[PDB]
Amino acid sequence: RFKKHVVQHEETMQAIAQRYYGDVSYWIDLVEHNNLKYPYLVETDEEKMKDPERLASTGDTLIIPIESDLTDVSAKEINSRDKDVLVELALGRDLNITADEKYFNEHGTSDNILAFSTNGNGDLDTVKGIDNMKQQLQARLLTPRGSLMLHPNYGSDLHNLFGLNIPEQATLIEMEVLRTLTSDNRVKSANLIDWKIQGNVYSGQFSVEIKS
Amino acid sequence: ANFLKNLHPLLRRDRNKKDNQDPNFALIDALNEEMNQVEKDAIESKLQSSLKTSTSEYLDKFGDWFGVYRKTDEKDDVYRARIIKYLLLKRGTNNAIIDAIKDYL
Amino acid sequence: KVPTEDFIEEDVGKSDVETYSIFTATPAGMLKELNGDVFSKPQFHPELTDRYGYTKFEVENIYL
Amino acid sequence: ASQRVDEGIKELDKNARKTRDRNNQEISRRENTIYNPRQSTNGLKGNIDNMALIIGYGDGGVS
Amino acid sequence: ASQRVDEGIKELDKNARKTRDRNNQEISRRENTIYNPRQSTNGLKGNIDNMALIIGYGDGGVS
Amino acid sequence: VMANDIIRIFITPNDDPNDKEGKQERLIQVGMVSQVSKVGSYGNDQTQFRITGQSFVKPFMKFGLGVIQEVQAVLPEVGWLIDGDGDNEVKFTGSSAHEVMTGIIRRFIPYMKYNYTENTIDNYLDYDDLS
Amino acid sequence: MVVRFQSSMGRSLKRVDSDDLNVKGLVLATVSKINYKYQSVEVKVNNLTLGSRIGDDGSLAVPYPK
Amino acid sequence: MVVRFQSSMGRSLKRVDSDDLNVKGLVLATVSKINYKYQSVEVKVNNLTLGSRIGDDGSLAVPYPK
Amino acid sequence: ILEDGKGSPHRFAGLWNQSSDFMGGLMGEDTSKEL
Amino acid sequence: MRRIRRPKVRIEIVTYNGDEFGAKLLGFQTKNSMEDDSSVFQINMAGDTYWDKL
Amino acid sequence: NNFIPQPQGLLRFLNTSFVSKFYTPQLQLSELAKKVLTNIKTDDIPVLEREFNDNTIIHKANDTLLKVQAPRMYMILQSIVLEAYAIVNCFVENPSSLKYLTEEDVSITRENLNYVADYLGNYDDYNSVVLDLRDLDLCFSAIELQLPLIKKEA
Amino acid sequence: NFIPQPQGLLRFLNTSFVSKFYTPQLQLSELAKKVLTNIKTDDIPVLEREFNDNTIIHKANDTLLKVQAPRMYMILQSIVLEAYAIVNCFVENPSSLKYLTEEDVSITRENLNYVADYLGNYDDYNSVVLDLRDLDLCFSAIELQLPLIKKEA
Amino acid sequence: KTRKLTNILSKLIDKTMAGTSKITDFTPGSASRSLLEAVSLEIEQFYILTKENIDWGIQEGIIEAFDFQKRQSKRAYGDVTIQFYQPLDMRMYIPAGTTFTSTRQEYPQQFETLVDYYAEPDSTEIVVEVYCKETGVAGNVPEGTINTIASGSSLIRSVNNEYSFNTGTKEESQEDFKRRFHSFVESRGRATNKSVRYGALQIPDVEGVYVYEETGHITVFAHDRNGNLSDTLKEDIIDALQDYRPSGIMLDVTGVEKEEVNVSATVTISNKSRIGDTLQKHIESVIRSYLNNLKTSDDLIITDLIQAIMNIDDVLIYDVSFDNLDENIIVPPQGIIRAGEIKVELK
Amino acid sequence: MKTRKLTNILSKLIDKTMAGTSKITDFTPGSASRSLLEAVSLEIEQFYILTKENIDWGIQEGIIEAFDFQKRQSKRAYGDVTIQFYQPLDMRMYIPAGTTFTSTRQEYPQQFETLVDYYAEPDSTEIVVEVYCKETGVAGNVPEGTINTIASGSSLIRSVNNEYSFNTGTKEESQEDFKRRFHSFVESRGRATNKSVRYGALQIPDVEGVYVYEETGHITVFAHDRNGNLSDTLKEDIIDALQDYRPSGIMLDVTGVEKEEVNVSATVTISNKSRIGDTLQKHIESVIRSYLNNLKTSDDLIITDLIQAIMNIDDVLIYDVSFDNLDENIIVPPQGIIRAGEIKVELK
Amino acid sequence: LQKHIESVIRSYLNNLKTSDDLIITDLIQAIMNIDDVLIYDVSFDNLDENIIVPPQGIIRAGEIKVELK
């Protein structure tokens, strides 16, 4: 895992390692992760134009490992070249099945609702990054608790919670949604920020803390 | 990085307008100038580590390791060219031998 | 595997109760140095014996 | 890899297994002197064990 | 002084260090029968320990 | 705390400024540590570290005079006139305990080397004024 | 514990004392020197010599069977 | 108690250990077979035979007095 | 280390296998033979 | 979250039924140790029935 | 070779117009194969005085008439075993043989493995061998992804 | 009670350009005189091995300073004698530390700086200078600490 | 070798104390201590700079002299031109980081502008350099693909790239860099059998070349082209091999001949009930395939033929013999064995 | 880059400080600014010297990495050891394998060990077995009468002594010998020539000091091992190796080398009359005999190198050396090697 | 290698039974199981015809002699 950062005006590479990891001494290993040539951070972009991929300048992103992966040579090699592909790999890659986004939001808690799609040309669509995490939360919420053919106790009792719209039913629904969202270890916490009623319609929203 | 950027963040970084004489600015300027000259020297050191750009003593070392020593009053370019060429003798062929005679001539 | 989350109490530490420098595996005790073939063949580290000199550790093995 | 290594070892003859133990001892006494092959090296020796069993490094294998 | 002493002794050959150990043991037999370069004696040994390597005081340093 | 370190303890009996006879900073015990261990009953929500050692009895008690069985130590057409030579035999002779004990201690004490930044056991142990 | 730090030996805990000093059984030695006048030898252990005190031959030595 | 259930012997409680394995004293035996080439016999205990290993005669046997 | 039961790599230290045969001449036996 | 635990001990005996023996369980100890040459265990039983005769 | 001996059958096997719709080979000897093969050809190698493990893939190839029916494809199998044998040796002993194998050399072995696997599918005598080689086809791909990474680690 | 000396060091020890900052005076210390006589007259024990490939071993004898600049080679010997003298007393036989004084080490450093500056012109033999600069700061710590040691002892 | 922060700072402190008597305070916060720490940090950075330079040198710098190129995963870049409806009347701004998205749906490639550009007051067209986001060969795009800009404007009409992106680059391992160098050095060998063989195989339509060596003459013959050699190829390869032949040694090139063998073998089977047309056909096919696959200058040893024919099935075959094959047939160096006529009798 | 000394950097810093709008400042000695300037200058000097040393190390390491040419490891010392018994053995005795031979002198605590079995037949008052130094270095080259100890030795043994110093152990391969072998390899890139054959013959680790003699259409290579012999297997291995490197269409043949014996009868003058002794004589004899061995084929018996080699032992102790009959260099033929020879020392 | 070849011949001949009979070609096959690249030619100096075993007797190896040439 890693933290994101950006190059500030005339910040030296010594200064970053000292602020995040404490000891300045660690900058030496920290430059290999960002694959930098000797002018590790340089102010001017027309100087980055010298050989763009092997440098960082003012306004560019940087990668900051956690201290345990700082010394790992494999983490060094991977972070050297992958660069922005970090987030995608770290959140993982999967087949996209939100083909009919307008449609699956008309019949949730019913089956047969999702389907493969095609993007690009001649290849099934795929999803990655934060979109993948959303899609997976979405599918997990719209699936009943014991309906996947292996590893059951997956999904929700959202199909079971339909009731007289009195507030206790609404707190129950809130708690089920929060449990469902907090099931995945990748997510830190969820919390409600609004619940709202319109006769026979529930509405509400939840904030979820995704790890960096 | 360079000596100005890292040095104690409360110290000055530019000439004083109150007076012309600034021992602070003289010291920092001298140290900046020396360490940037050392930096230029160290960047130029990369060229001496390669036979393609090594000159003077490092070209001589390369020649000595390849066994091609420097001829009296021989400049760097011809000496490098002979050193590189020396590994393509293709000895034993008749046209090779003719080339070696043309070189010797 | 066991995480700290199941630990009620712990009492673990180094100790210099066991300390030997020379280790050997004598053969069955009938064979004896003054009436036959090679009796024993020990092993030691030169740095180790400085702190603990000539500390022997012997074991008879019935098998050999 | 480990699963098929164990499955293949099950079928091995007694002599094959004895020689694999002896080879393992011989390598051992002279040493000091989330499976994903992408972006990781944790499952290295597992793939070697199958390949060494099926191909045959010694009568049984090594490691 | 401590740092460059340790680097010296790392750089020494195993026979060199063995002889240094012998000389230390001989000296020990002959026993009987905050740091500042100024106004301080605690760092006396560091200056002496740094010597006996730039000068060949026996095949290896002492103390 | 690495093993075999030396710890000195000093106890102040009574008040300094009062000028009592107890103001002496008398040392109570000195010795060599030989064990360090974590200790803690998390049921009672408390943990401690325990260190124990012995007062310079560790070097002697651990130093075992072993026996070497298969060493001739011969020389070509030369030999030692005193017997008990070539072999690891050593003989100590004296007409009193303080004469013998001096030879016994002095035989092995210097070579018992350790990583003290400053010396060995002979500086820290007087072993004198014997009779 | 603190009090256990006493003389001990073996894998199993055993109080070492003046019993351990006493030898159990018979041991072998080689005849290095003989006192011809008294016919009492001194035998050598692998790294120790028995008998052999300040007494030349008569007042201390090892007896021989007759 | 529960922990007392260990190796023990005698009317009085005594820790049986590797001391009990060691014999105390001298024992008698009968000469069953002799190795005439080496003149080293093998003696029989009442229900056990000493000496007498895979070694025919030279490398293991019981010495005889001379 | 958890991978494949590797355990601690420092268990097989630099003194595990490096050693040498034991004989005298280390202490007191050599002092008489300095001819 | 804190884990929840519901222990449920069973006992089986082979020569009185074992399931009735296991019901009157109250506590036991099982000292097992490679240091010593003997493994020993203890069981505490309730006084509802005269176990001495059984 | 330096540490332990090898079976006699494997030493004897190793010393020495069809088209697929998905694959084509090129008969490159890998740099590590080039130098290990010379050692196998020379007598400087220990060897065992007896053979066991009759279920190995080597005896399977020997039993079938693949040698005389299709000596081309018999040759390719020897090449597959030569690379596959060498990359087993370096991890278990002699690490100095590393930095002499590249992902391109390991990649083309799958090309040659599947180019022979289609051919083997046309005659269901060789099913026992087919079954074996398919297991190795996924084994090599893992090594290709980790070989650049392992080399930097070591 | 003297550790035997290496054969190299023993052979080494038994026998225009000018710098603007530091200059030599070719003055020897009383303590350095007494040692020189001891080695000249008495046959000190000497080792037989030469495992330690440092100091004058293939550095001070390998360089062409011995033939090119023999005067400069006389400075290097004086520094070795003065470096070997101070190491002699402290390690063993401290009775000879009474003859050493502040000015004895002062002049040694000045001689060190002059020979060191001259060696800086040569680009091959910088290895010798590498040790001399480390030794240069060693003498200065004795210089600023030797008057306290004698009064303490 | 490189020294760390601590050693340099400690040497500076010790030398200051040796020289300077004015200075005695070195708490964290002294202008002098941090002056020395700044100096030390810059020295350590220069040490790491030399370290990286030495690493590059040992890795490829000696080899760079020789005729080879190194690749460093440089992302693809190429000139791109933009057009507007009318000439401008203002200095329009073009930020760095501007994204030029692919117009084709099938191409997910994207590109970004590293440096800012300022349109002229009245120029109707401007060309800028754009670098791809993705490294490797995947960043290559055909001509006429980049025709959309994320930061669109009214004045902007369309975008096009006349020249294709050729600067796509992929980096291999050090072994791949070293192998081509080795192959080039090895290829410079001449006047040897292996070098002659390589130089013959360099020209196309050369395969399975066989070389026969003698003190007198050197003779090379091959069946490269559909089992036959043509006169034109002989003329071409004679001229090529002049650089490879040894000086003063004759070189000769000839064609390849074949010797068809006639054999009528007999096979005894233990179980006569098994015999059938299919069995003898298969035996004849195995024999003819075995006799076809013979190496150049390979003598037809009867022993190998016996081994080969018997190894079909040890239980089946009991006895074998050849009516019309007396002993092993020796062949010249230029001859190759072929199956002329084969017949198999079952007994 | 160019090396900058302290004085130049200090002058440049002083001049920048003066020119930098600073007249108040002074650079007398004892000042704090002068000491800081000097320290910085010495740091820059250290950096430049370490940079030059790293450039040299880098060049060496790149040359090692480049190609597949690397230095070979050190050879373990070995030699003969002589056993003296009190009386001839009455029955046959067996020596256990891996018997350890050592010494008691503190200068040579290096161990030794036997590799093969040995048997002491009866009625034999002495037995000699070969021994190999376990430590890989020059410490095994012990002088005469050093190895005076045996482990697991019976009472029969009376004395243990080596009759001759080993003088066979070596350290890691010399930089100059590696450099020369690498020159041989570079000149040998063009195949079909004398130097190519030379390198193809020398690349085997066993063979040492080969020679080539080129008769018309007829190469001959005179190859021998460190012992001066040429076993058939090694000869065939050399031929197979040279097959790749042999010029095509020209004969090659090999026939070893024929040894020759000469007696030097050397005489040496020794400054120190006390140090003269039989031990030094034996050491001089062994040094000369060893010099005689490990000599390549087709080189004259040069006496200048002999005297420089024997004077190398001690320049001061050894005064002068002279000879009686071999004062003129003996020209050796292509198939001659000077390896045998009996040495008699005649001290003046 | 000759020792190995003699041991293979012995194992082959000893494996026969009463119902089997010594055949030259079968012996050739058995011994030529070794890779044909190593052994290029085999011939018999004494054996030139197939030996017919009587029903009661069994053919087996006696004292075998193998040589290069």
CB contact under 8 Å between O41 and M307, yes or no, is no
Q: Do chains N and I touch (3 or more CB pairs under 8 A)?
A: yes
Distance from CA of F89 to the nearest CA of G (A): 5
Q: From CA N35, how far away is CA N50, in angstroms rounded?
A: 22
Question: Which one, of E39, E38, E40, E35, lies nearest residue E3 by Cα?
Answer: E35
Residue type, F3: A
Quick check: M27 contacting B, CB < 8 Å? no
Side by side, the strands of the sheet bearing N78-85 are: N149-150, N100-102, N112-113, N126-133, N78-85, N157-161
What lies within 8 Å, CB to CB, of N60 at 6+ separation is none
Q: What's the sign of the alpha-carbon dihedral N133, N137, N138, N139?
A: negative
CB contact under 8 Å between N100 and I33, yes or no, is no
In sequence order, what are the beta bridge partners of H44? H30, H49
CB pairs under 8 A between E and F: 17
Give the best residue of C50, C54, C58 to mutate against chain F (max F CB count within 10 A).
C54
Residue type, M223: H
Resolution of the structure in the document, Å: 4.5
In sequence order, what are the beta bridge partners of M130? M78
Tokens of L153: 């002892």
* Locus of tokens 């020879």: N341
Q: How many H-runs (helices) and E-runs (strands) does chain M carry? A: 8, 13
Tokens of A43: 């102010």
CB contact under 8 Å between J38 and H6, yes or no, is yes
DSSP B88: G
CA distances from B35 to L146, M2, N21, N43 (A): 36, 17, 20, 11
What's A94-111 look like in SS3? EECCECCHHHHCCCCCCC
**Technique used:** cryo-EM
Give exposure, M164-177, as e/b (b: 16+ Cβ within 10 Å): ebeebbeebbebeb
Q: From CA H22, how far away is CA E40, in angstroms rounded?
A: 64
CB atoms within 10 A of CB M10: 15
Question: Which one, of D49, D58, O35, lies nearest residue K74 by Cα?
Answer: O35
In sequence order, what are the beta bridge partners of J40? J31
Tokens of E12: 């020494």
DSSP B55: -
Question: Which one, of O51, O48, O30, O32, lies nearest residue O40 by Cα?
Answer: O32
- CB A193 within 8 Å of CB A206: yes
Distance from CA of B6 to the nearest CA of M (A): 6
DSSP N125: S
What's N229-296 look like in SS3? CCCHHHHHHHHHHHHHHCCCCCEEEECCCEEEECCCCCEEEECCCCCCCHHHHHHHHHHHHHHHCCCC
Question: Which one, of N199, N195, N218, N215, lies nearest residue N207 by Cα?
Answer: N199
Q: From CA E44, how far away is CA L145, in angstroms rounded?
A: 8
Distance from CA of O18 to the nearest CA of K (A): 27
Distance from CA of G59 to the nearest CA of C (A): 29
Residue M93 DSSP SS3: strand
- DSSP states of K35-54 as a string? HHHHHHHSS-S-B-S----T
Q: Which residues in chain L have their CB less than 8 angstroms from residue M16's CB?
A: none
CB contact under 8 Å between B86 and N186, yes or no, is yes
Question: Which one, of A111, B94, C11, lies nearest residue M247 by Cα?
Answer: B94
Tokens of K9: 């059958």
Task: Report residue J2: phi and psi, to 5°.
Answer: -95, 135
Q: Is B38 exposed, middle or buried (0-12, 13-18, 19+ CB in 10 A)?
A: buried
Residue O33 DSSP SS3: coil
What lies within 8 Å, CB to CB, of A116 at 6+ separation is A95, A96, A97, A99, A124, A125
F45: alpha, beta or left? (left if phi > 0; alpha if psi -120 to 50): left
Q: From CA J49, how far away is CA J42, in angstroms rounded?
A: 18
- CB F103 within 8 Å of CB F97: no
What lies within 8 Å, CB to CB, of G11 at 6+ separation is none
Q: From CA N197, how far away is CA B92, in angstroms rounded?
A: 12
Tokens of L112: 């060190």
What lies within 8 Å, CB to CB, of M182 at 6+ separation is N67, N68
- CB O1 within 8 Å of CB O67: no
Q: Which residues in chain D have their CB less than 8 angstroms from residue K101's CB?
A: none
Q: Is M268 exposed, middle or buried (0-12, 13-18, 19+ CB in 10 A)?
A: middle
Tell me which chain G residue has its CA closest to the CA of residue F34.
Answer: G5
A210: enclosing H helix or E strand? strand A201-210
Residue M104 DSSP SS3: coil
Q: Which residues in chain F have their CB less than 8 angstroms from residue G46's CB?
A: 67-69, 87
Quick check: M1 contacting L, CB < 8 Å? no
Task: Report residue M257: phi and psi, to 5°.
Answer: -110, 165
Largest CA distance in chain L: 45
Quick check: D36 contacting A, CB < 8 Å? no
* Locus of tokens 């067209």: M125
Side by side, the strands of the sheet bearing M125-132 are: M99-101, M110-112, M125-132, M77-84, M156-160
Q: From CA G18, how far away is CA G14, in angstroms rounded?
A: 12
CB contact under 8 Å between N148 and F77, yes or no, is no
Q: From CA N225, how far away is CA N209, in angstroms rounded?
A: 8
- CB N45 within 8 Å of CB L120: yes
Residue M130 DSSP SS3: strand
First to last CA, chain H: 56
Give the orientation angle of helix M5-19 with respect to helix M31-56, to 10 degrees: 140
Give the best residue of F101, F104, F111, F123 to mutate against chain E (max E CB count within 10 A).
F111
Give exposure, N207-219, as e/b (b: 16+ Cβ within 10 Å): bbbbbbeeeeeeb
- CB N172 within 8 Å of CB N74: yes
Q: Which residues in chain H have their CB less than 8 angstroms from residue C31's CB?
A: 59-60
Residue type, M188: R
- Tell me which chains share at least 3 CB pairs under 8 Å with chain N: B, C, E, F, I, L, M
Q: Is M189 exposed, middle or buried (0-12, 13-18, 19+ CB in 10 A)?
A: buried
Q: From CA A126, how far away is CA A128, in angstroms rounded?
A: 7
Q: Do chains B and O touch (3 or more CB pairs under 8 A)?
A: no
